[PDB]
């Protein structure tokens, strides 16, 4: 599987959703630029967000989404933020996608 992602480790931990949305706003065009390098139509299999907390625990996941799309990334972040942060500071925010997989064309044989 092929992933493309970008992340920012903040100078200082953040504690407020507005800060996180603001970092997402600066990362998005960087992810777009990176992904456009390799997939100019921005078509992907999945995308999602990574938050790494001040204890170095993190949460990520991706969900199906066909392009790579800031609105959806922000929505995902806000839910992960609410919900997983658990009052901790956030040290790093990451956005990523996973590309659609290459086609499977090789069927193995039982070797009779």
């Amino acid at each position: 599987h092929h992933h493309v992602g970008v992340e920012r480790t903040m100078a200082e931990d953040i504690h407020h959703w507005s800060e996180c949305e603001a970092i997402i706003e600066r990362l998005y065009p960087e992810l777009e630029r990176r992904l456009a390098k390799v997939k100019p139509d921005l078509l992907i299999a999945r995308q999602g967000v990574k938050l790494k907390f001040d204890d170095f625990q993190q949460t990520t996941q991706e969900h199906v989404w066909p392009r790579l799309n800031k609105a959806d990334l922000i929505a995902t972040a806000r839910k992960t933020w609410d919900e997983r942060r658990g009052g901790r500071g956030v040290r790093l925010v990451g956005l990523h996608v996973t590309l659609l997989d290459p086609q499977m064309e090789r069927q193995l044989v039982l070797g009779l």
Binding site: A45, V64, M104, E105, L112
Partner: protein
């Protein structure tokens, strides 16, 4: 040769002996049925030289002995086209067989009986009877895994193996294998033969809900199945069938159980966006979950997530979805168990609650 038989005593028999005939015959006579009146019996036989179906009909009405061959579909369509209950009078008249009923008359071309190919006779080595539904289960359980036109001719057919009191069928086409075994309630000699895939299909044509048991005779080079007044014979394939044991996964340490229907439907929807040619889907197993994904050259994708029982290590494996569906459609039970090893090794799939059948499917590379 003459007989008179009422329509309905002919129709099923004609349907049955027309089984081996399919499509466009290679010699004319192979498109014909052999009819022979002997004693109080009309015999009808249809063949493709690899196998034959013979049906016997009692003749209660006046008859004269003799034999001839006539075009099977025309003779069938004539009898089927006549009114229900018609008495169909048949007599051979030189070349040409006359068929008359009411005010309808037909004359059909013949080819001489002495000229019809006989699957000449031989000596059963194994004889046994079982319910038709049991044979049908054995065959239905595995027939889809037979190869069609592999150069390895002994794969294009189905192995029938008697062990102990069990009859077992095995089929494989190199990508998957199916095995089913069932108790026949009779001690049987250890023996195994390969029935050509068209003989297996025909034998299935033959089997019907049925009051009547199936008697099976296995010769050196032939199998015979008798059900009521029908006798099917096929040549066997003379080759060595691969040993199915060596292709079973050696040490499946991962065991997944799932509901059979929910699994099948999840695969069936993922299959919609699988590659039309290669049919690849990816399965990701993790704690009590299976995720199936498919994506195609058109850059569409599907994902299905299912709860399953699984506590093994996480793994991903790819499969041709139509092979997996085939197995699931064959199992048609409540829960399935899949035993895996790793992404490049075959999986074994069975009914979680039955050991009658088992299936081994080789994966696709991820």
């Amino acid at each position: 040769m003459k007989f008179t038989v009422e329509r309905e005593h002919l129709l099923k028999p004609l349907q049955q002996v027309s089984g081996p005939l399919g499509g466009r015959p290679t010699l004319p006579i192979l498109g014909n049925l052999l009819l022979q009146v002997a004693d109080g019996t009309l015999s009808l036989t249809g063949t493709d030289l690899e196998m034959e179906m013979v049906a016997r009909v009692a003749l209660v009405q006046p008859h004269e002995p003799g034999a001839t061959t006539v075009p099977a579909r025309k003779f069938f369509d004539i009898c089927r086209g006549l009114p229900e209950g018609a008495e169909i009078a048949v007599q051979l008249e030189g070349e040409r067989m006359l068929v008359r009923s009411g005010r309808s008359r037909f004359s059909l071309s013949t080819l001489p009986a002495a000229d019809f190919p006989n699957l000449d006779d031989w000596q059963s080595e194994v004889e046994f009877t079982l319910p038709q539904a049991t044979m049908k289960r054995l065959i239905e359980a595995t027939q889809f895994s037979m190869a069609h036109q592999d150069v390895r001719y002994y794969l294009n057919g189905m192995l029938f193996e008697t062990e102990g009191e069990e009859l077992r069928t095995v089929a494989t086409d190199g990508h998957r294998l199916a095995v089913c075994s069932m108790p026949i309630g009779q001690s049987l000699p250890s023996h195994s033969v390969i029935v050509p895939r068209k003989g297996v299909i025909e034998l299935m044509r033959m089997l019907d809900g049925g009051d009547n048991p199936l008697r099976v005779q296995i010769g050196s080079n032939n199998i015979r199945a008798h059900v009521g007044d029908f006798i099917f014979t096929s040549k066997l394939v003379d080759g060595r069938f691969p040993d199915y044991r060596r292709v079973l996964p050696k040490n499946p340490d991962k065991h997944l159980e799932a509901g059979c229907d929910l699994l099948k439907q999840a695969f069936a929807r993922a299959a919609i966006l699988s590659n039309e040619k290669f049919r690849g889907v990816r399965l990701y197993v993790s704690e009590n979950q299976l995720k199936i994904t498919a994506n195609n050259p058109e850059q569409e994708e599907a994902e299905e997530i299912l709860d399953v029982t699984y506590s093994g290590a996480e793994m991903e494996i790819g499969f041709n979805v139509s092979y997996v569906l085939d197995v699931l459609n064959a199992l048609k039970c409540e829960n399935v168990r899949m035993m895996l090893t790793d992404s490049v090794s075959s999986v074994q799939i069975e009914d979680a609650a039955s050991q009658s059948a088992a299936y081994v499917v080789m994966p696709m590379r991820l």
